[PDB]
Amino acid sequence: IQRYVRKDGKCNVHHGNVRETYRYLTDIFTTLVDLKWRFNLLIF
């Protein structure tokens, strides 16, 4: 059965049809630190 929240704490939700994607660039710092490590280290 599908759960909303996994036992480890992660949440089974995806945010689709975000029309205003620029907002991710508006608060760039949050997007950066929210990235996977490979991508921080790459950008770095």
Binding site: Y4, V13, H14, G16, N17, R19, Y24, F29, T30, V33
Partner: protein, 187 residues
């Protein structure tokens, strides 16, 4: 690194709506978070802003009265992943107790909505705000669903986030609904 920036990926619904929910008349607005990361110790509070005059004469410019949105049950503390519809039950203690569909537009009021929690990565507290003026409060309306199920994940459709539709809803003030109920139970 300042947290106010997070507010950019926190959305408030464009309108507040009033409709019936399990026999209670409710004022509802919807809130959302565009990121996969979280707002920690999330909480929602709401203030009604309208001027007033005391019996004695004192005019009070933009008088703030807290609107109840879960304070006594701790349901004002949000777990906000997929969008939530925040509900203010319009009861005896409500500032909308004596407001009918008729009177609403002729009232000169504004609801300030405040979302405060911590950006997950920086421990820092963010405050997202928005307002609903009297004309943005749709009487007799419901929010359109956004959630659908996909393989292994719940998918949100932000196209529909702000969208509302009309339902059958009394034109009476919450107070007048009670008066009908008093005679109904006494019958």
């Amino acid at each position: 690194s300042q947290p106010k920036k997070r507010a950019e990926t926190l959305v408030f619904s464009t309108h507040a709506v009033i409709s019936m929910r399990d026999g209670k008349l409710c004022l509802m607005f919807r809130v959302g978070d565009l990121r996969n990361s979280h707002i920690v110790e999330a909480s929602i509070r709401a203030k009604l802003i309208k001027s007033k005059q005391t019996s004695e004469g004192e005019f009070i410019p933009l008088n703030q009265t807290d609107i109840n949105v879960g304070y006594y049950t701790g349901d004002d503390r949000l777990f906000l992943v997929s969008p939530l519809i925040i509900s203010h039950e319009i009861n005896q203690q409500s500032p909308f107790w004596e407001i009918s569909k008729a009177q609403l537009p002729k009232e000169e009021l504004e609801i300030v909505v405040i979302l405060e929690g911590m950006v997950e990565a920086t421990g820092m507290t963010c405050q997202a705000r928005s307002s609903y003026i009297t004309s943005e409060i749709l009487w007799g309306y419901r929010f359109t669903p956004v959630l659908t199920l996909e393989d292994g994940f719940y998918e949100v459709d932000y196209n529909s986030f702000h969208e509302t539709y009309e339902t059958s809803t009394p034109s009476l003030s919450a107070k007048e609904l009670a008066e009908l109920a008093n005679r109904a139970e006494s019958n």
